[PDB]
Amino acid sequence: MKTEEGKLVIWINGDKGYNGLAEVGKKFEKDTGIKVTVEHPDKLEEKFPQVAATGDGPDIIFWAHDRFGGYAQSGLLAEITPDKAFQDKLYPFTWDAVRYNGKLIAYPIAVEALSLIYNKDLLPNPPKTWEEIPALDKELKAKGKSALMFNLQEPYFTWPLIAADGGYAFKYENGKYDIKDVGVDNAGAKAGLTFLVDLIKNKHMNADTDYSIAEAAFNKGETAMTINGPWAWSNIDTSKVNYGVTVLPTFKGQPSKPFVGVLSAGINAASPNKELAKEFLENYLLTDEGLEAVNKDKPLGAVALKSYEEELAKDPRIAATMENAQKGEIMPNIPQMSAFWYAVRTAVINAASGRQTVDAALAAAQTNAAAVKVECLEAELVVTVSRDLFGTGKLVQPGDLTLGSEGCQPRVSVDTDVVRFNAQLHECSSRVQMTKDALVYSTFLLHDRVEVPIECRYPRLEHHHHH
Numbered sequence: 272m273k274t275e276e277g278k279l280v281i282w283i284n285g286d287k288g289y290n291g292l293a294e295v296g297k298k299f300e301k302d303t304g305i306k307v308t309v310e311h312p313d314k315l316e317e318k319f320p321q322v323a324a325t326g327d328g329p330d331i332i333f334w335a336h337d338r339f340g341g342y343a344q345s346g347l348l349a350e351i352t353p354d355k356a357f358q359d360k361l362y363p364f365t366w367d368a369v370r371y372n373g374k375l376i377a378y379p380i381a382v383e384a385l386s387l388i389y390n391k392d393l394l395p396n397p398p399k400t401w402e403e404i405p406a407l408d409k410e411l412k413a414k415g416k417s418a419l420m421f422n423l424q425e426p427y428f429t430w431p432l433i434a435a436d437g438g439y440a441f442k443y444e445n446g447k448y449d450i451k452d453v454g455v456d457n458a459g460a461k462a463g464l465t466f467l468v469d470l471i472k473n474k475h476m477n478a479d480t481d482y483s484i485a486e487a488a489f490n491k492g493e494t495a496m497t498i499n500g501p502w503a504w505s506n507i508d509t510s511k512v513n514y515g516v517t518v519l520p521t522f523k524g525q526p527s528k529p530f531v532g533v534l535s536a537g538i539n540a541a542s543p544n545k546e547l548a549k550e551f552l553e554n555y556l557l558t559d560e561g562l563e564a565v566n567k568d569k570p571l572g573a574v575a576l577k578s579y580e581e582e583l584a585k586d587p588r589i590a591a592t593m594e595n596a597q598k599g600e601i602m603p604n605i606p607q608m609s610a611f612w613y614a615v616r617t618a619v620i621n622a623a624s625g626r627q628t629v630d631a632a633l634a635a636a637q638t639n640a641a642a643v644k645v646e647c648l649e650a651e652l653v654v655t656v657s658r659d660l661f662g663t664g665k666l667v668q669p670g671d672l673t674l675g676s677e678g679c680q681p682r683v684s685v686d687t688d689v690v691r692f693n694a695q696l697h698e699c700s701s702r703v704q705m706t707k708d709a710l711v712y713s714t715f716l717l718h719d720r721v722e723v724p725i726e727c728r729y730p731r732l733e734h735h736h737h738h
């Protein structure tokens with residue numbers, strides 16, 4: 272077990288202020304002898320639920336509150352025990368974010384929202400509207416520069432624009448999310464995405480741009496604007512690029528609705544140090560002195576500790592962050608939330624690459640989120656289709672569903688709640704895509720006219736040998 276006794280192990284996403292948390296670590300060793308080890312695994316949002324299945328993994332996991340409901344469902348999270356004294360010390364807004372089934376399942380740390388960052392030297396007046404940007408780009412290209420570059424590979428980043436004209440994740444009727452009602456296929460969503468597809472088509476943005484491309488492009492000086500969070504400031508500051516942080520553009524008059532996220536720290540249900548951890552977080556990290564350590568390394572954003580948030584909220588950058596939170600909505604923490612993220616991730620990618628039409632793409636994003644769970648084994652993958660597609664109570668027969676290319680003959684288990692596909696990867700895949708580090712296998716599940724994309728990533732070191 273990573274988790275030993277008398278020793279703390281923390282997992283935090285690589286982009287956050289990990290070394291600064293390490294300083295808050297060492298200040299906890301010099302006071303208690305308990306060593307704190309902080310590490311930053313890749314895809315750690317996905318690594319955590321696998322290892323902690325078997326009691327493995329860290330004592331404390333740091334991530335945006337949205338994944339924690341899923342974690343807690345699968346019984347991999349400790350319920351935290353903070354007293355009345357402490358609960359008053361953070362913003363109620365943030366406690367409610369870390370709650371699930373009426374239990375607190377993590378400690379809220381900071382509030383994050385995507386603002387629009389811009390180069391005052393290249394563009395002393397940011398655009399107020401999305402519709403301005405194509406034009407703006409032309410003029411800018413003529414000067415050897417570009418208008419806007421941001422991470423098109425994650426959904427987090429393109430959502431503010433989809434939601435804008437009335438996209439949403441899961442409908443919230445009567446204080447409960449209807450998990451069969453996804454607002455990714457509606458007209459407002461189609462509007463947002465189409466506009467974004469055209470930016471790509473008109474060479475105003477490239478479909479390939481990812482987090483590290485966009486970040487360099489801007490920090491070098493090659494792009495006017497970018498979309499990103501508080502954590503990206505640390506670097507921008509270093510490039511000495513003269514920048515400001517303002518409200519995201521509007522679309523069809525309406526504002527961009529970023530998802531607001533609450534950086535939360537969660538205690539492992541299998542950890543033998545649940546009290547030592549409880550102490551680290553409550554009295555060393557969640558303090559005016561401790562938060563400063565991290566926020567110094569990589570800005571946390573609008574920190575949830577009332578105390579320091581107030582001392583800090585006189586920053587125009589956080590000022591913008593908060594304005595954008597306002598026009599946002601907050602992330603659901605339900606389990607299905609990660610199916611959503613995958614659905615949409617694929618949709619955007621397929622639309623922007625022309626693999627699917629925006630209509631078909633977002634049509635699929637619905638079924639995928641509402642009724643599909645994909646699970647990728649070594650040389651076979653498992654596709655679990657919920658029998659009731661959209662809540663109708665009208666179930667489908669196994670003959671309505673079709674997986675992979677023609678030669679793909681999967682074994683079909685059929686319960687009364689699901690229909691299960693167990694399929695031979697190589698034999699069923701419709702296309703494999705090689706990247707510097709990854710291999711993505713892709714195939715389609717058809718139902719009705721609709722085609723939902725089934726998609727499995729692996730690293731490229733699985734070739735050596737026998738795939």
Ligand SMILES: OC[C@H]1O[C@H](O[C@H]2[C@H](O)[C@@H](O)[C@@H](O)O[C@@H]2CO)[C@H](O)[C@@H](O)[C@@H]1O
Nearest residue numbers: 284286335337338383425426427532612
């Ligand atoms: O892209 C989907 C992804 O978005 C969010 O993750 C954010 C995270 O919240 C940010 O703080 C930052 O680290 O960038 C991430 C996006 O690349 C969700 O929290 C996550 O569950 C979701 O999969």
Ligand SMILES: [Ca+2]
Nearest residue numbers: 453454456637
């Ligand atoms: Ca829908």
Ligand SMILES: [Ca+2]
Nearest residue numbers: 505567568569
């Ligand atoms: Ca720093």
Ligand SMILES: [Zn+2]
Nearest residue numbers: 285311312313
């Ligand atoms: Zn790392």
Ligand SMILES: [Zn+2]
Nearest residue numbers: 405406473475
């Ligand atoms: Zn144009």
Ligand SMILES: [Zn+2]
Nearest residue numbers: 696697698738
């Ligand atoms: Zn083969």
Ligand SMILES: [Zn+2]
Nearest residue numbers: 649732733738
């Ligand atoms: Zn292998």
Ligand SMILES: [Zn+2]
Nearest residue numbers: 735736737738
């Ligand atoms: Zn062989």
